[PDB]
Amino acid sequence: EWSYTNILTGPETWHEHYKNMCSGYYQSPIDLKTDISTLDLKLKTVIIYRNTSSTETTTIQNNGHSAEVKFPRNTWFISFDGILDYKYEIIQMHFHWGNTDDRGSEHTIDGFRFPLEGHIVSFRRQMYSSPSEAIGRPGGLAVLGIMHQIVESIKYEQTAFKAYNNFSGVLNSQFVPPNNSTIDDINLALLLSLLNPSRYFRYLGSLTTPPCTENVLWTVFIDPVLITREQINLFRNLPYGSNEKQTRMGDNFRPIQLLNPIDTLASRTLYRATAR
Numbered sequence: 001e002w003s004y005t006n007i008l009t010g011p012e013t014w015h016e017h018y019k020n021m022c023s024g025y026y027q028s029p030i031d032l033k034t035d036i037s038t039l040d041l042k043l044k045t046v047i048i049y050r051n052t053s054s055t056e057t058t059t060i061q062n063n064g065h066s067a068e069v070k071f072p073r074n075t076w077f078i079s080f081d082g083i084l085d086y087k088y089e090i091i092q093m094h095f096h097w098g099n100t101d102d103r104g105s106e107h108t109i110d111g112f113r114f115p116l117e118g119h120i121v122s123f124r125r126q127m128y129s130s131p132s133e134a135i136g137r138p139g140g141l142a143v144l145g146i147m148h149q150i151v152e153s154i155k156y157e158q159t160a161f162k163a164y165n166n167f168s169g170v171l172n173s174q175f176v177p178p179n180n181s182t183i184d185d186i187n188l189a190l191l192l193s194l195l196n197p198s199r200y201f202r203y204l205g206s207l208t209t210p211p212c213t214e215n216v217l218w219t220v221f222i223d224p225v226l227i228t229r230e231q232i233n234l235f236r237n238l239p240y241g242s243n244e245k246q247t248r249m250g251d252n253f254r255p256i257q258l259l260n261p262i263d264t265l266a267s268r269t270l271y272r273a274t275a276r
């Protein structure tokens with residue numbers, strides 16, 4: 001078993017308890033270094049889009065380590081090439097945050113931590129027929145990282161919580177693991193429009209929880225969307241699962257991994273995109 005906050009099962013132990021693949025050399029998260037990265041003008045604007053025929057419900061669960069929104073199949077998609085032909089299908093979105101406002105994100109940008117990093121997880125439907133087929137297979141997944149930053153003066157409608165529809169009020173101290181609830185759908189298109197979808201880091205990496213599978217195409221947007229202190233504190237009301245030492249959920253982020261650990265057998269490169 002694993003945790004964030006119990007020293008015995010925490011992130012420093014994952015390379016031993018889950019050798020495949022938390023001991024690998026293409027792990028995430030990393031520090032996204034603007035100066036070190038390679039600008040690749042070929043990397044296009046990201047588009048998130050919905051199947052307007054889909055009517056099934058969205059749910060959210062406290063899984064003991066995060067709040068995880070589970071989307072119905074065949075409903076939300078990502079395009080990286082401008083074509084709306086269902087190459088990447090979104091599965092779930094979950095979040096990583098801090099006990100305090102100066103930490104929480106998994107990635108850093110030039111060493112800087114944000115209070116809340118959201119991960120929109122998709123599978124390469126272009127190749128694999130289902131999430132369960134893709135999740136353990138090479139090149140199966142693509143994850144979007146969305147940084148959030150706290151502002152003191154803002155209307156609700158301009159915060160990320162408008163896109164999330166406040167998660168239908170489920171973020172509270174009574175939302176105990178492993179409870180799940182039906183919630184209003186998340187307007188992921190609106191969420192993406194709150195930042196610049198052309199301006200992002202891109203690299204090949206891993207899941208950031210065990211078993212840390214090295215099959216994730218990462219895109220991390222540089223500009224954050226905006227939330228309030230009230231909204232970050234809602235996440236902090238969730239209780240951790242019983243695997244954890246800490247009672248309230250927070251600091252559910254993995255430590256930074258190197259782009260190229262010294263034992264790598266083929267270095268990877270950190271790429272960056274910007275608008276045309």
Ligand SMILES: NS(=O)(=O)c1ccc(NC(=[Se])Nc2ccc(F)cc2)cc1
Pocket residue numbers: 091092119121131132135143206207208209
């Ligand atoms: N933090 S993260 O974004 O790297 C990340 C970590 C773990 C992860 N796992 C998933 Se989606 N597992 C799963 C989903 C569907 C299924 F059929 C079976 C298993 C996704 C993302």
Ligand SMILES: *[C@@H]1O[C@H](CO)[C@@H](O)[C@H](O)[C@H]1NC(C)=O
Pocket residue numbers: 051053054055073074075086
């Ligand atoms: C869109 O939703 C409909 C209705 O649920 C479904 O039958 C169809 O296959 C979906 N389209 C895609 C491309 O997943």
Ligand SMILES: *[C@@H]1O[C@H](CO)[C@@H](O)[C@H](O)[C@H]1NC(C)=O
Pocket residue numbers: 156165166
């Ligand atoms: C969500 O929460 C905020 C804070 O209370 C509130 O202003 C907003 O009206 C709520 N959104 C709805 C109506 O779902």
Ligand SMILES: [Zn+2]
Pocket residue numbers: 094095096119208
């Ligand atoms: Zn994550």
